[PDB]
Paper text:
GBA is primarily responsible for catalyzing the degradation of GlcCer by hydrolytic cleavage of the β‐glucose moiety from the aglycone to yield free ceramide and glucose.
In addition to a previously reported structure of rhGBA in complex with the O6−Cy5 tagged cyclophellitol epoxide ABP 9, a serendipitous co‐complex of O6−BODIPY tagged ABP 5 and N‐acyl aziridine 3 was obtained in this study by accidental soaking of rhGBA crystals in complex N‐acyl aziridine 3 with additional ABP 5. In the resulting co‐complex, clear electron density was observed for 3 bound covalently to Glu340, with its ring‐opened N‐acyl chain bound in the narrow active site cavity flanked by Gln283 and Tyr313. Specifically, the BODIPY tag binds at the dimer interface in a hydrophobic cavity formed by Leu241, Tyr244, Pro245, Phe246 and Tyr313, which we reported previously to accommodate the Cy5 tag of ABP 9. Whilst the binding of ABP 5 could be considered artefactual, it is notable that very simple torsional rotation of the linker allows the linker and cyclophellitol unit to be placed in the active site, putting the epoxide warhead in perfect super‐position with the trapped aziridine without any movement of the BODIPY group itself. In combination with the previously reported structure of rhGBA in complex with a Cy5 tagged ABP 9, this ABP 5 co‐complex provides further evidence for a unique binding mode of this hydrophobic cavity, which has recently been exploited for the binding of a novel class of pyrrozopyrazine activators with chaperoning potential.
Numbering used by the authors:
A (entry chain AAA), B (entry chain BBB): 1 to 497
Write the structure that this text describes.
Amino acid sequence: ARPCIPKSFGYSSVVCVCNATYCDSFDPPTFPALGTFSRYESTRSGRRMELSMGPIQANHTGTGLLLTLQPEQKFQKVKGFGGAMTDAAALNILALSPPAQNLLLKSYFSEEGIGYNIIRVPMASCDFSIRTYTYADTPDDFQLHNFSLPEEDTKLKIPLIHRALQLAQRPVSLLASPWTSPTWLKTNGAVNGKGSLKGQPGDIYHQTWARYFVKFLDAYAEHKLQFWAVTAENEPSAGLLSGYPFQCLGFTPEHQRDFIARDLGPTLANSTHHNVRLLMLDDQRLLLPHWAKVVLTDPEAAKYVHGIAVHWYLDFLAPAKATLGETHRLFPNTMLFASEACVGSKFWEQSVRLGSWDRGMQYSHSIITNLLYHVVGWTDWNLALNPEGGPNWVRNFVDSPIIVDITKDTFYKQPMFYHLGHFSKFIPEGSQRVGLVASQKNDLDAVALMHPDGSAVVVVLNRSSKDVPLTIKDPAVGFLETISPGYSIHTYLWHRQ
Amino acid sequence: ARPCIPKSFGYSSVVCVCNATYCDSFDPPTFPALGTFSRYESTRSGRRMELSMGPIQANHTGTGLLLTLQPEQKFQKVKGFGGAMTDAAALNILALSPPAQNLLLKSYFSEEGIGYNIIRVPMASCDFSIRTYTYADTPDDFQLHNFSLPEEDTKLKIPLIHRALQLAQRPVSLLASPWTSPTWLKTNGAVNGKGSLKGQPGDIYHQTWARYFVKFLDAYAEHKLQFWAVTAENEPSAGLLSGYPFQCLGFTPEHQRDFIARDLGPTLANSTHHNVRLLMLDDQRLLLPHWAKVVLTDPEAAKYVHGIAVHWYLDFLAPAKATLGETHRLFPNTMLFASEACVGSKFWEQSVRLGSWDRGMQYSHSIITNLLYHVVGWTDWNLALNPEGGPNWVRNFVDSPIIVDITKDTFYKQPMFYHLGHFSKFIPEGSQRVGLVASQKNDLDAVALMHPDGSAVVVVLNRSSKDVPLTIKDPAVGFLETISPGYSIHTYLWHRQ
Ligand SMILES: [C][C]1[C]C([C])=C2[C]([C][C][C][C]C3=[C]N([C][C]4[C]([O])[C]([O])[C]([O])[C]5O[C]45)N=N3)C3=C([C])[C]=C([C])N3[B](F)(F)N12
Ligand SMILES: *[C@@H]1O[C@H](CO)[C@@H](O[C@@H]2O[C@H](CO)[C@@H](O)[C@H](O)[C@H]2NC(C)=O)[C@H](O)[C@H]1NC(C)=O
Ligand SMILES: *[C@@H]1O[C@H](CO)[C@@H](O[C@@H]2O[C@H](CO)[C@@H](O)[C@H](O)[C@H]2NC(C)=O)[C@H](O)[C@H]1NC(C)=O
Ligand SMILES: *[C@@H]1[C@H](O)[C@@H](O)[C@H](O)[C@@H](CO)[C@H]1NC(=O)CCCC
Ligand SMILES: *[C@@H]1[C@H](O)[C@@H](O)[C@H](O)[C@@H](CO)[C@H]1NC(=O)CCCC
Ligand SMILES: *[C@@H]1O[C@H](CO)[C@@H](O)[C@H](O)[C@H]1NC(C)=O
Ligand SMILES: *[C@@H]1O[C@H](CO)[C@@H](O)[C@H](O)[C@H]1NC(C)=O
């Protein structure tokens, strides 16, 4: 292993400094002997996913908090964890020297990093781009004869995706989402602002737009990349808003329902890409459960929809139970998947806060809340940004788990990187959430899952200043006696046989 | 009566221009015989609370939407409507020549204007102040011997409140709310940031803070002003947030519960001000019903709490039914009151948009939703701001129904002014919300109330671009045939006998 090189920028915790010749890394994965548990610990005080091991005790006495595993209480199976290969992310990564590029990609995708198995790929330009382009900017090209991938795909995004997949030992799933259509398909004739597809579902505008999805998948397939899933549109509610500042395409839930039923569903189903999954919504969870009811109560739409994609924006969240919980209850066979998460700032906070433990705790709290309300996966936004939180053509700067300083050939791994890692590294695809009950009221956030091989994983987050003595009971093996320190996150792993 | 002098600033509608010698005004109220209705109309196209009359007829000629009054279905009684006399509002008003000041105060408080009967008064400084002060900044003065009102109170706020009350045809209710305590009572020793009262409820810090409320009410009573109500703290959740940029004081719901039970309740009850009502929360409705459950399930706190004050800023995240509706169901004898609203505070909102019809529709849509979910009153924020949305010492610039241009001795009455007026002018204190049944699904927002004298008032908001043919039925009078134009608000009034 190689430890964190810590640096303070004057906030609550440190970043880990990486360059062309040095980055913090794990030893290859090891399983703890039966009768023992593994612990990975990160702290505000500066510990970064440090490994320790302890015994599983046969007996326990005391008045202390007990968390009891309920392994027969089975919930959702996990698809995975990752982030977005935006134009901004790819530009920042490829501005580093080649050896630094490889250490950044290994940090995310290697078993000696945090084992990401999802990459979200924008279909052409978004706000995290340095220009507005689509794949078909020739006006009224209904046959899409002038459809092509620009350099942002062929020189930045595609080569980094190939390199990520080569570094990963876990199979990686690609997810594609469009922000805007060509402007000649839109009522307002602009990439941004209030505007939807022209005409009505079933018509030439809607069929052309569905064919654009197939052309995108064809072009990526020519580059030997296959997609797990596409979303119907990034944030369809955005294109309903007057003055929306960047790339968008407005759909009401009724418009999305009818576009899926008449155009996108049939076009994908009749293509060579029929095995690609379709996710609906791809938007703020405040729109649930109404959006799900409108789309999935229509059997002609529902038969094409594999899942519901939700967004997380720290500053503006609807309650999980009324949104995620009620949607699962109405549509239990339609998976919920978190397709975009990032920390934006208030008028009083900077876009990037180097070493913010608070922003780390917000990611991990969010991930736990999502896993407790049926969500099968979690996708960060930009894989990397510069210290301004860019580039971004509308200056919609936000934070990222990895901040690249091109002038120093350096990148900084934020607390958010490690908070995400406590899940992504230790919860492989096919893991199933199981029950975990507290003996008493407590300030901790915790979630338990079982790996495909039947082994246990528990993540415990302490967002309080106080150390909390804790016992985890697993009826199969016994008691894990531990302490959750104030401002810490732990992952516990143990064999059950 | 004097009509609106319209001026466009390139937004969706016009402002009404007022100066030292001219402001748009109403004639005294004059209401017609049984069988006649009054209609006040405002439109994006530029009509401003224009009066027309027509017949309520025995025969029904409409074949569209019917709204039927159900006067036997009775809900909440109304406390009233108004806005906040902040330092910023008082500075802006007093920058006008005295004749212009009088036309502005008459616009809000006179029967020649929109009949405000509520003024919210900050207890010392907030963001809408040009400096940081409290009433007791001399440290370790636990008996508050050095408590005093500065010129902001004695020169600006108090004289303007006297003049408002002189001009009002209705009794005006004053509501007080503190942002911060003296910093020597706080854990962080700062006017802002993450910080609460030192120590624990019942101790010297908490007793001093409760005594500060009595000292404030004593000081205003010496100036012959008496309060209807106080809130336990403005936005108590703000003082729980690291780096909160302006005046705040953090309380968890448990801290608010124990402060009310041990200190504020008993201190107010043992004073000459025992008749002043105490409102809890004074914060976003997303905190309901949880905050209400924590405070009101403790009888020692609940016996001092008259009501729950709500702010509008996270309404889009929190459906009324899940927050206001559920709180009413759990605590049906504890009134809900809307104590703060404004547009221009979100990062996607330009601070001031002179003539914004959208911002007008936001006010009226909020007031209707509130009234349909048991809310008894609705209080705007700053009564007046400058064209930048200030002054504000942290540059938290926002919009206001009246914008003062002091360099031209001019003020502008925004669509928000008229949207608020469609309620404030025509729903006096003690009005009762009654049933209004829609015959079919429609795009209108509507609410019916009955005046203390038994006469009817119905407000109809059309946020759609399409004219809606409408019939209103009063079982005791007959059928009102009308049209709700696209982007209009109407108030209908009629005698029932
Ligand atoms: C750069 C930043 C980043 C960003 C996301 C924005 C935006 C977009 C802000 C969206 C605000 C918002 C409001 N809502 C709730 C709202 C909901 O109440 C509706 O019923 C739904 O149909 C729809 O979901 C929308 N969701 N998001 C923006 C608008 C709309 C205008 C401006 C100027 N900007 B901006 F400031 F430029 N800007
Ligand atoms: C890249 O980072 C590494 C680790 O911080 C730097 O290596 C350290 O350099 C200092 C000063 O030369 C030595 O005292 C340390 O012993 C080195 N540590 C290790 C573990 O090798 C390296 O210098 C950095 N590269 C650049 C170009 O700045
Ligand atoms: C205050 O506003 C009023 C109304 O807009 C202005 O009055 C107008 O003045 C012009 C000449 O300057 C007259 O021809 C109009 O007939 C006036 N209208 C009315 C209804 O009287 C007035 O000038 C403004 N005051 C200042 C100083 O500009
Ligand atoms: C998600 C958007 O799709 C992406 O384009 C933005 O860069 C990012 C930050 O603004 C995300 N936005 C949101 O989640 C919405 C913000 C709340 C209004
Ligand atoms: C209400 C506050 O009490 C007042 O001080 C602010 O000026 C006003 C506008 O910012 C309101 N607060 C907020 O908007 C808080 C942010 C919403 C969660
Ligand atoms: C479309 O593509 C064809 C074939 O490459 C090319 O000849 C034509 O000029 C293009 N038209 C444009 C870019 O307008
Ligand atoms: C506070 O008031 C007392 C009299 O009650 C006075 O003696 C003292 O000097 C005052 N302190 C300040 C700083 O004004």
